[PDB]
Structure 1
Amino acid sequence: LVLTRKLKEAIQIGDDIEITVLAIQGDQVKLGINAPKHVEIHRKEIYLAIQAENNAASHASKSSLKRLNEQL
């Protein structure tokens, strides 16, 4: 879904998350995000990176850890 929001115009997501356009700066927008705190909000680039490293960390062979322990 694509939408257009003028300056203090907000968006309602579920019951709810609410996105409030708080400023246009103008190479950037200062968004505001209200949500319950069982739900976290992150910059996408940060969240993707941590996804990536989680996946990268899920392939440790038993041989690898034996060698790594030794050297430790």
Structure 2
Amino acid sequence: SMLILTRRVGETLMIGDEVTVTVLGVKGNQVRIGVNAPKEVSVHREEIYQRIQAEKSQ
């Protein structure tokens, strides 16, 4: 299920025990986001993530 909420610029969301996702700013329909996560946790834009999955399948 998808958790849907609101975050204003400057506000943060905590995922799990070590990850944070912060809205750093908004420009039209563009959102500048800051993700802080432990070294072991990878963070990728979806377009990159998809290619990674496709290449891990070989």
TM class by shorter chain equals 0.7 to 0.9
| Total equivalences in the alignment | 56
More strand by share: 2
Paired residue secondary structure (2:44)? coil
The TM-score, its normalising length taken from structure 1, stands at 0.69
User: Is the radius of gyration larger for structure 1 or structure 2?
Assistant: 1
- Structure 1 unaligned residues grouped into runs of 5+: 59-72
Is the counterpart of residue 5 in structure 1 residue 3 in structure 2? no
> What runs of 5+ residues in structure 2 fail to find an aligned partner?
none
In the alignment, the residues of structure 1 paired with residue 22 and residue 56 of structure 2 have an alpha-carbon distance, to the nearest angstrom, of 31
Q: Distance in 1 between matches of 2:17 and 2:34?
A: 17
Which residue, out of 16, 29, 43, partners 1:14? 16
**How far apart, in 1, do the equivalents of 2:56 and 2:13 lie?**
32
Q: So what's the TM-score if we normalise by structure 2?
A: 0.84
- Alpha-carbon separation, structure 2, partners of 1:53 and 1:40: 16
Say which SS state the counterpart of residue 38 (structure 1) adopts. coil
Q: Moved runs in structure 1, 4+ residues, more than 3 A?
A: none
Aligned sequence identity (%): 52
Q: CA-to-partner distance for each residue in 1:9-49, whole Å, 9 max, x for gaps?
A: 10011112000100101221000001111111111111102
RMSD between aligned residues: 1.2
Task: Note the 1:56-71 alignment, pairs <5 A.
Answer: 58=58
